[PDB]
Structure formats: structure tokens, C-alpha cells
């Protein structure tokens, strides 16, 4: 019924007002490429726009921009009515106006910067009372026409003639302020918006329905995640794109209040909550006023928490109330705030990954301009540490640092600067290197829970295990039907045991990115520190993490420093049980066999390793990993050669047969050496550029073995007779 | 309530309570409900406020005026008992407590009938598969459950639902119902409030999951089921059951499945306590927690109490001989007190497992501690041969395969190592399933491949030293 109705949902071009619409859609509408459109919706209002062909976007949506989202006064998910427009329009005047409340400090004509090189080659539509947003100059503003012929009938045309007015028009509260963040204002976390949209758009925009239904609404969000990482972000757009009333609580400055009177705070915010329709509660950092009350001291705090739980259960399904909060130390927060009823969903706002830094930092630059040597996808891969607050840091200095060079061609006698010049300073690479030169990362100390980079073809030889590796962590993740036809539940462990240097850690890292599932590494050292703190929970928190990233892959590097710790199965005569240990023991033994979570653990001391570890259903699968031979060894040098300018006669093979005992890290020794030669000769020249076969002769000579032969054996005895190990 | 009571100024609480109590006591019978009672009587030894002070006081003062005469009866709710004053707890206050554990299988699956009784279920809904695959899930857990597959059902049901009407008809929603793959979706992101509490319940691996050890079976339920079943012919001839058992033997035999099945047949709740548990939860110097467990097993008698993995808590001080000096630390010495201070008369059984006999500490074999030595070999031509069609029960093994073959191919191997077996030529054909997509009938071939790398888990010297522990293991305590 009315084939003309299309779901609304926030687009993806990042561009002006351009729909895009499903294969099926526009045969079904008769309506090609570059076709002129009419949206029609709500409030007797109309907007027109230009469609866009797409494919793998869904089976029936349409694809909304934010630009033209207030222009029908229509929000996510809402109905609008489309209709082809196969009418010929074309623009003859056109009085257009800006809006003076973004437009202050711009002064000059206004044209050439902003729409001259917008208008032409487009071939855009405008509509009566169009609220459009053009970009440039380091800034954004809005713009309104006001003033044409009748609407539409009206394209952009390099026929078109223009006139400024000097004084734009005020905004008036039939529309939003685009200036206001939104859910493309947010990149990175597209999952966990995913889940709030789930968890909160559907109750908030058909309070009568979810009345209606009697079933319970998630009220209880809290995000939870590194400082900076854009949880008050986050909220502010979940705000703003739904028809919600917003209700802002602040953490200090309830607590900066005097005694009995944040109480009162409280309890009026709830209060119009309750009474203004759907509403949201935002707590911004819920730990300054709800800390555990274990651990806190005056007796008004405490009455805070009471009444903030009090106000939390007095919550009922009818008040269509939804509270958010927001904390970065999630485990600070008092245990009885997250029980059912008052904050049972809980969404991890994590490290963003180079992704989605990539996205931030397009996001945080899109006002700005950047010159073409400008590379955001380089700049996104050298930073690691970085979030959200951090790119926006480094972008802000970035534009400081071009500004800085620019004082004399921008009069600084003059109080405010045209925009003609503006735009004419530009944020070169150069600019962003010496910001990313200065600047201190906020999570460098937080986990990585990402995809690594390291593919199979960063590992020579090791075919075998490569395919057991598969085997054992793409098929159960990939064909569970298998699984439970033929009655084995897969094991959820293996065990990586060898000589130094052989490739335990990139197998992990590698099986990780062939299944593109989540990698946590946790090395030994880093358990030993941790634990030193006697904080048991952050090995459990350890655990959890992995949990909520299944499929994912739990690697235990370098076990050989924790079974060292108490010098080993046999040492002095005690075990090397202790600590963390037992603890991995008991969070290996207490996960949910059906969660895809795989545990990896690695060590080159399998003498020490303590019996507990190889217990069937902990890490019964061993595999052992030998020094390469010679044919990996000539894979090996191929490998780690990928990147750098090898000579036609250099001979790996002959360099693999004259290596005999060395294993992958002396082989990468060998090759970084040989470079360091090539390097010292390039200096030396200066005072070509391909590294030779003399350097790698020159190399060998050098050259130095790594495992000893007695250890080549005992490990060769290792590799045989170690399932045996537990029992005596 | 117990926050909306904190949450009131001082002075004004009391009041509160005061009021509280003496509307019970005038009118009628009554109850008062007092939920999250840890909210406002904490322990006072650890408390700051004067005011949280009053109120406990008045709390305690409100319980010791109830009269017989009043009729009035005072339950109380709270997650953390221990949290709760000691005061509280005794005669003439709360003397009566009752455990809202987590439920069982069954139980989840009435709490599931129970939530989604009001919903409309499609006809491939199998809601005991769900609670069969929901273990740490409480009854919180599963109401969300069920409330998150109905939202999933209306998800997608967007359409056929008019959004723009104000209030849906029941025509519709009648007819949306929640799938069974609606209930997979929901499952599949749950979080479990309850995955690290202790289990108490009945284990589900019977005597069928083990092969072979029949003597050993035949002594368990001598050990466990007579005193339980006829106390009358203990009681006639004069001798008190032993309350212990510790088995000790090669890895991978099955102590741990032949605990979980004599709880099983005698039909006995059985708690399972692990070693590396053990060292864990006592790191943080909470010697009431091992009592908890002793504790928490005497309320589910008849119950049997297994200590696994003996070996990790025996190598926390390197054993009996080590470097010189004793592996008695920690729970061991609390483990003992309370095995010393269980009363004869209650069914708690103690079964105790280890792999490593020669470093057990010799105080746990004393006679009223654990006495009953059980050592369980590693199988023999027919165990072997058992324990594979226990094994594979579950898979479509084909007809050509000789299991008898396949066991007298492997002399040295344990049950683990078997199960190892099974499991590599299941992954054979698994591999050969995947393999012909781009048949499903594990064979001959695969199980000759997988015995091709076999590998076993016991040395013929272990073998040795653990027949000479066998013989000599009552000796131990003395020198
Ligand atoms: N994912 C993101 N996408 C875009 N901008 C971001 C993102 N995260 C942070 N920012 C920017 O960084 C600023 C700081 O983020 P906030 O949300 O204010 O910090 P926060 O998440 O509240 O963490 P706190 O307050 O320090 S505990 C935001 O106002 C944005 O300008
Ligand atoms: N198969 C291989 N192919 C290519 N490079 C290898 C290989 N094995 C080792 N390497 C090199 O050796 C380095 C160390 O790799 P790892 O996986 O960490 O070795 P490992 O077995 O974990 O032993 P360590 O203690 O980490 S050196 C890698 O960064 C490579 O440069
Ligand atoms: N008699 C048996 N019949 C069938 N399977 C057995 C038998 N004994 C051992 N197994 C297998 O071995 C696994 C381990 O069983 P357990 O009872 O834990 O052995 P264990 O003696 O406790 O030694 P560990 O340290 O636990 S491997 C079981 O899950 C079975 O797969
Ligand atoms: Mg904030
Ligand atoms: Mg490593
Ligand atoms: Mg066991």
C-alpha cells in the first residue's frame, strides 16, 4: 500500500543534500542517476534534492542528510512521502540570506569564498526557505534563501545571478540549530550508537506503543569508557536526534552544592523529567556522586547515593523516563547503582582504532582546509594512543600552527579579518607532523582490544601449524553446524611452545586477522606488575573485556616470566604456581563455552610451565613451533625483505643454506644489519640506494646463533614428551 | 526501603521506622518487608556516621518490642548476608533465614514458562533447549531475556505495525510472535549476573559417561548411597559411615566424572571447589569464604562437597618434602578445622581428587578427616575400550570401526587421552566435511589417522611411581 513512503535514517555521503536509495527503489520509481526528487513531509513542507545510486545499503531505506533533516522538520526513523520530479527548473534570482548566528566575525564578500566554489558544478536544487550548510574558511555556517521564484523551479545554473544584502536574517525556534551535535558529529563508534539507538530511540519516539505493549524499556544506560573517548558526546547526539526532552546533570557540580540543597537538585531534575514527556537524564560523571559507598566519607554523600538509588527505583514504565550516565572509572561507581533496575545495560565507549581515528579526524577537519600533500589516513596510522579529545587537540594545534605562520599576511591591527584570506590559509602535512611531533596521548597505557595488522604473509614457512590454526578458530566460529552435527565441542585453548624467536607471537596476531576477530595480547611482565598492586579484579577485568569482543582471541605472551616468578616446576623444589595464575585458571575454567572467546598462550620455557596450564579443557591443544628449516628459512628473509629495496643478486637461498640453526629473529638480525650497512654506506656517500649483496656477506659474517644445539635437543625432547608433564 | 530510608535527614528516618512498626503492630496481622536491609544496618564496625549508628540502634530496639501478642513478622531482603550486623542475626531478630539461590535448569525453565506465558511463542520455540543453554542466568536475567526477544520480534515487525497510529490493534499483535531465532539472538548477547557464584545442584553425568572402573563405582555407592539410604543397618551393627574419600591417581582417569556421577545417582546437590579457586579467593585473606563453602554445604545435605585439583594446593609450598619445608598453607589448615568440626549426623559428603599423591599433606589422610584411599589406574584393554563408547556416544560413528582394535592400539593412554583421540578424528572429519562443501559419518580412516598421532600423557616411570603410591599411601603420615 502507497509505494511512496520511505523509512528516514542519517546518510552516509559526506556531502550536501544527496539521497541515496536502494537498487530496487529507483526502477521501481522510474527514476535514474541523476535524477531531481521531492521529499515531502510533515508540518506542509517540501524538499528537494538529487538521488544517488546505491547497492549494499539495505533492502528498503532511503538515506537521509542532516543538512535537509530540519529543512522537514523530520527526525531518525520517520516516514516521509517521496516523489519523482520530472520537471525542467531553472533559476533566474534567487535573494538569499544568511542567519547572524554564525555569520558573526566573517566579513568581506561572502560569495567567492563560500558560494562561488560550491554552486558551480553541482547542479543542485533549491527549495523556498532552504536551510543549507556550507563549509570553509575554518568554520561553518548555515545559509537561507528567502526570496525566488515559485518553489521549487529552481537548480543550480552558472546562469544564475546573485546579490548580497549585508544583513542577515535571525533564526527563529520552528527550526533546530545545526551548530548542535549530532550523530555524524560522532566517529568511531558506530556499534555502540548502533546499540543506543536500539536500546533508546524505540521507547523514546513511540511512548504510546511501549505503553501500550506493557514490556519492559532498558532505562538504565550507562557508557563507560577512557576519558576523552566522547561519552557526553555521545549523549548530547542521542539527545538531540529524537524528540526528547534533555535534562543535564553534572557530577561536580551537584556535589559543589551545599548539603541538602543537591539533594533538592535531584529531585527536581526527576521531577521534570517525569512531568516533560520522553524525556532523557544524562549524569555526566556519575562516579563524583555516587562513588562506593564502602569507600567515602561524610554522611552527605552517602545520603546523595540513597537518594540518587531512591530516585533510580521510584522509575516506572509509564513516566517514559530514560536515564543515561556517564563515567570513565566504571568500577568506582557504588554496586548497588548497577543492579536490575537501575543500570542494567551497560555500553563500553572504547579506544577508537585507526578507523575510526581516520573518522574523527575527518570529522574534526572538515571545517578546516587542508592542502593536497595532506594525508589523514597517515596521520590516523601514527597515532595509537590517541582519542577523540586527542585528535581534536592535535587538529586545533595544527590549525594554530598554520595561523602562527600566517600573522603577517592576516593585519592584526585589524579587529576581524576577512574571510577572502581565511580560506587562503591552508593546514599543510607539515603542520600536522609537528603537531603529532608535540603531543601526549591519554590512553597509551589502556589495552588494545582491535584487528592486527599482521597477516599470514608477515610469517615464512609454518604451514602446518597455520592450518591447525585455522581448523581449530575459523570453523567453529565459521561453521558451528559441523560442530554440533557431529557431537565435539570444540577446545578452547592452545598452547604455543618452541625456541625463542620462531613466530609464536605473529601465529597469534596472525590467526587473529584472518578470522577478523578481536586480539587482546597480555604478556607476562604486564601480569606481573598488575597483579604487584594485589588487584585481583583487572586480571578478571581482563577477561570480561575479551568477553564482550567475542569473537576474540585471548594471547598470553611470554609465560616463561610468570612461570619464573617462582623459579619453576622443579627450581629450588616449590611450584611456580602463584599470583595471576591460578586466577587465569579460574577465568579459563568459569567462561561460557559457547562465547567465541579463544585462548592463546605462549612461552619458550615449557621445562617451567606449570602442569595446571595443560589440563584438558584449559590449553590442551599444543602445538609446538621448531626452528625454521630450509625452506622456511628462505620464506623467513622473503618476508621480513618485503619492504626494503633488495638487489636482483642477492641470493636468500644461499643465505638460508648458510644459516643453519638461526631462527626467525636472527634472520630479521641479519636483514637489519645488512640495512644498517647500506644505511652507513648511503651517509658515507653523501658526504646507491639499494641494499646489495655485499652488504649481506657482510652481514653473515657477524651474524650470530641464538639457540644453542643442548637446547635444540632438550626442546626437541619438549616437543615430543610434554602432554606427559602433569603428574609427576 | 531500605535507600529511600537512608536517603531521608537525620532524625527523619528514625521517625520513619518508628512509624513503620507501629502501623504494623496496630493494624492486624502484618508484615514488614525491610528490602535491602545491608542499605541501613550495615556492620557497625565499619561504618562512619553517628546517624547510621542511631539507626541500626533503633532498628535493633524496633526487633527486641515485638511482641507474641503483636502478630507482626519482619522479613528482610538483602544480596549480601554478610554485610548484614552481626547484631541482626541473632535470637529474637532474625533467626530464621532462608537461601533464594540460583535456580536450576528446571527452575529457570518454569521461570522462563513464567515470563513468557503472556507472550505468543512460534511452534520451533524450544524453551528447554533455552534454559539448557542459559547457566549463569537468575530470574532477573531471564525476564530480560524474554523482554529483549520480544523486542527483537517487534523490530522487525516495524512495518506491519502502523507507527503513525496512535494505539495498535491486537489483530496485529497477535500475530507477531517471537521466533526461536529471536530467543538464539537475545541469548547470544546476555550478560550472566551469576556466572561467578558457587553451583549448587545436581550434576547431570551419570554412570553411563564413565567407562569402566566398576569396583570403584561399587565402593562409591557403598560409601555414599548406604548411609544415606539405610541408616538403620549403620545404626544396627554399630559403625559410623566415614564421611571422606580422596582419590589419587594418574591425570585424566576420571576422579572428577566419578564425583559427578555418585552425586548424580544418589541424587545429592554437589558443590565443586578447584584448587587454583582455592588460591585465588585466599589472596585476599578471607578465611570466612572457605567457611562459606562448609557452610553452604551443610544446608544442601545430602550433599557431596569435591575438593579438585589437590596438586595445585599441595604446590604452593613446592610439597611434602620440597626444599625441606611443608605444603600445609592457607585454606588447608581452615579445610581441615572444618572438616574436624562437621557434624556426624548431617549428610554432607567430602570427596577429595588429586594427581599427585606423593606431595599431599599427610594430615588430610587422618583417620575422620579422609580415611577411604581410592586409586583409580589408568584403564586397562576393556576400560579403554568403555571409555571410547562413552566417548562416542554422541557421534555418528560408523559401523567398520573396531573400537576393541582401536584399544588394544593404545596401552599407555588414559581416558583424556582417548577423549584426545576421538576429538582429533571428529576434526578429521570435520576437515573432510568442509573440504567436499567446496560424508557426514566419521570412519575408519579417520580414526587411523588420528591414532597415527597419538600421543601419551603418562610415562611408564609415572606408571611405576604411581603403582608404588598405590600400594603405600596409608603409610605417609609419620615420617
Ligand atoms: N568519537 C568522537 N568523535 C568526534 N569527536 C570526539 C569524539 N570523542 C571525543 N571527541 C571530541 O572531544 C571532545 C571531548 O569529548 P567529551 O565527550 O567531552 O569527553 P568525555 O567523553 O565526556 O570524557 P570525559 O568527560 O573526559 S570522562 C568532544 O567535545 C569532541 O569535540
Ligand atoms: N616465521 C617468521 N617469519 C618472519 N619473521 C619471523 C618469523 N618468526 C619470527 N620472526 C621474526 O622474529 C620476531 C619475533 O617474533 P615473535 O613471534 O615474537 O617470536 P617469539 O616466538 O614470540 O619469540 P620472542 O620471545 O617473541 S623473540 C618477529 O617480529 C619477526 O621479525
Ligand atoms: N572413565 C572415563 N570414561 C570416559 N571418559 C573419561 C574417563 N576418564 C576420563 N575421561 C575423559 O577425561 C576427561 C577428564 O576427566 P577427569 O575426571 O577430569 O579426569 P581427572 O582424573 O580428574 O584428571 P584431570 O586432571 O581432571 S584431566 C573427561 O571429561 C573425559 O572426557
Ligand atoms: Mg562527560
Ligand atoms: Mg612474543
Ligand atoms: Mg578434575
Known amino acids: 500500500n502507497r509505494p511512496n513512503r520511505l523509512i528516514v535514517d542519517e546518510a552516509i555521503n559526506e556531502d550536501n543534500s544527496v539521497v541515496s536509495l536502494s537498487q530496487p527503489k529507483m526502477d521501481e520509481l522510474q527514476l535514474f542517476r541523476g535524477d531531481t526528487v521531492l521529499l515531502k513531509g510533515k508540518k506542509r513542507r517540501e524538499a528537494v534534492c538529487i538521488v544517488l545510486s546505491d547497492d549494499t545499503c539495505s533492502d528498503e531505506k532511503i538515506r537521509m542528510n542532516r543538512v535537509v533533516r530540519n529543512n522537514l522538520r523530520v527526525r531518525l526513523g520517520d516516514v516521509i512521502s517521496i516523489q519523482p520530479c520530472p520537471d525542467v527548473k531553472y533559476g533566474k534570482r534567487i535573494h538569499v540570506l544568511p542567519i547572524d548566528d554564525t555569520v558573526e566575525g566573517i566579513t568581506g564578500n561572502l560569495f567567492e569564498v563560500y558560494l562561488k566554489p560550491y554552486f558551480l558544478e553541482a547542479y543542485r536544487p533549491i527549495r ?145 523529567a517525569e512531568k516533560n514527556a520522553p ?38 514504565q509509564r513516566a517514559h523516563v530514560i536515564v543515561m550516565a556517564a563515567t570513565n572509572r566504571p568500577n568506582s561507581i557504588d554496586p548497588a547503582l548497577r543492579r536490575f533496575g537501575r543500570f542494567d545495560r551497560e555500553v563500553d565507549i572504547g579506544i577508537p582504532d ?96 582491535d584487528v592486527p595488522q599482521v597477516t599470514w604473509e608477515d610469517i615464512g614457512g609454518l604451514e602446518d601449524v597455520k592450518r591447525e590454526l585455522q581448523e581449530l578458530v575459523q570453523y567453529p566460529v565459521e561453521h558451528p553446524d559441523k560442530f554440533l552435527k557431529f557431537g565435539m565441542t570444540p577446545s578452547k585453548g592452545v ?42 579484579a583487572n586480571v578478571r ?111 636468500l637461498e644461499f643465505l638460508a643454506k648458510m644459516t643453519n640453526g638461526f631462527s626467525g629473529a636472527d634472520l630479521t638480525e641479519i636483514c637489519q644489519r645488512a640495512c644498517k650497512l647500506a644505511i652507513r654506506e648511503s651517509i658515507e656517500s653523501e658526504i646507491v640506494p639499494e641494499i646489495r649483496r655485499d652488504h649481506f656477506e657482510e652481514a653473515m659474517r657477524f651474524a650470530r646463533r641464538s639457540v644453542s644445539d643442548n637446547d635444540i635437543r632438550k626442546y626437541e625432547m619438549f616437543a615430543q614428551t610434554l602432554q606427559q608433564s602433569r603428574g609427576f
Open 128 to 272: 523556498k526557505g532552504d536551510i543549507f550548510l556550507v563549509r570553509g574558511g575554518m568554520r561553518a555556517v548555515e545559509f537561507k534563501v528567502v526570496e525566488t521564484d515559485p518553489s521549487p523551479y529552481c537548480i543550480v545554473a552558472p546562469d544564475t545571478v546573485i546579490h548580497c544584502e549585508g544583513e542577515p536574517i535571525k533564526r527563529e525556534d520552528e527550526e533546530e540549530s545545526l551548530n548542535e551535535v549530532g550523530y555524524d558529529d560522532i566517529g568511531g563508534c558506530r556499534k555502540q550508537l548502533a546499540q543506543i539507538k536500539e536500546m533508546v530511540e524505540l521507547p523514546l519516539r513511540h511512548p504510546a506503543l511501549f505503553k501500550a505493549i506493557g514490556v519492559k524499556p532498558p532505562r538504565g544506560i550507562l557508557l563507560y569508557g577512557p576519558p576523552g573517548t566522547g561519552k557526553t558526546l555521545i549523549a548530547r547526539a542521542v539527545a538531540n536526534e529524537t524528540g526528547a526532552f534533555f535534562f543535564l546533570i553534572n557530577g561536580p557540580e551537584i556535589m559543589s552544592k551545599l548539603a541538602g540543597e543537591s539533594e533538592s537538585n535531584l529531585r527536581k531534575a526527576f521531577e521534570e
Open 279 to 316: 524525556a532523557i537524564i544524562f549524569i555526566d560523571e556519575l562516579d563524583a556522586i555516587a562513588p562506593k559507598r564502602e569507600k567515602t566519607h561524610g554522611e552527605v554523600e552517602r545520603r546523595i547515593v540513597s537518594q540518587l538509588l531512591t530516585l533510580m527505583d521510584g522509575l516506572k
Open 354 to 449: 585507526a578507523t575510526g581515528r581516520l573518522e574523527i579526524l575527518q570529522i574534526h577537519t572538515k571545517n578546516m582546509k587542508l592542502a593536497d600533500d595532506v594525508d589523514l589516513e597517515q596521520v590516523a596510522n601514527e597515532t595509537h594512543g590517541h582519542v577523540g579529545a586527542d585528535l581534536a587537540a592535535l587538529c586545533s594545534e595544527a590549525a594554530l600552527q598554520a595561523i602562527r605562520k600566517k600573522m603577517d599576511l592576516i593585519d592584526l591591527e585589524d579587529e576581524t579579518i576577512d574571510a577572502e584570506v581565511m580560506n587562503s590559509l591552508a593546514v599543510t602535512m607539515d603542520d600536522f607532523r609537528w603537531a603529532l611531533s608535540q603531543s601526549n596521548p591519554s590512553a597509551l597505557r589502556e589495552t588494545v582490544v
Open 495 to 536: 598452547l604455543f611452545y618452541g625456541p625463542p624467536g620462531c613466530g609464536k607471537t605473529l601465529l597469534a596476531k596472525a590467526i587473529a586477522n584472518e578470522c577478523q576477530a578481536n586480539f587482546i595480547s597480555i604478556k607476562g611482565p604486564e601480569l606481573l606488575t598488575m597483579w604487584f598492586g594485589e588487584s585481583e
Open 541 to 651: 577485568e581482563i577477561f570480561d573485556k575479551a568477553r564482550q569482543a567475542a569473537p576474540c582471541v585471548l594471547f598470553f605472551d611470554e609465560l616463561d616470566s610468570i612461570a619464573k616468578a617462582r623459579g619453576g616446576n622443579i627450581g629450588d623444589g616449590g611450584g611456580a604456581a602463584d599470583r595471576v595464575i591460578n586466577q587465569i585458571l579460574t577465568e579459563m575454567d568459569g567462561m561460557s563455552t559457547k562465547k567465541n572467546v579463544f585462548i592463546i598462550g605462549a612461552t619458550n620455557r615449557p621445562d617451567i610451565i606449570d602442569p595446571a596450564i595443560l589440563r584438558p579443557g584449559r590449553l590442551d591443544q599444543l602445538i609446538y613451533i621448531p626452528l625454521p628449516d630450509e625452506k622456511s628459512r628462505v620464506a623467513i628473509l622473503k618476508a621480513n625483505l618485503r619492504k626494503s629495496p633488495v638487489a636482483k643478486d642477492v641470493d
